[PDB]
Ligand binder design. Sequence first.
Ligand SMILES: [Ca+2]
Ligand SMILES: [Ca+2]
Length: 123
Amino acid sequence: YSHKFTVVVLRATKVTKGAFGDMLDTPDPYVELFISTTPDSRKRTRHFNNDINPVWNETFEFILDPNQENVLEITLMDANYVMDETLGTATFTVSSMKVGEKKEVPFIFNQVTEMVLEMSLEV
Ligand SMILES: [Ca+2]
Ligand SMILES: [Ca+2]
């Protein structure tokens, strides 16, 4: 744990679903931040139900060694009441990047889903 890696889940609007999640009400947004290199990078953001235009913009720091396979395994899911439902996940190997600034990654799922993740690398 010697490399400074900061991530910031910005937004995740136009999150599509259908009638499935609409059973109770409009889709239920909820993020799931997962990584592969740290001891146990299994964090997430518990948002709410009925919402296709949420905004977390939460910056979580992660000082870990980039010697392993730093695979930023994020996952935009749907927070249910029994079992979560993944809608669109993302993966980005940060162990090998051009550290020096932030990173506005445009991650659109399907076609209308839009989720921007701002992560800045440093050491
Ligand atoms: Ca709902
Ligand atoms: Ca749900």
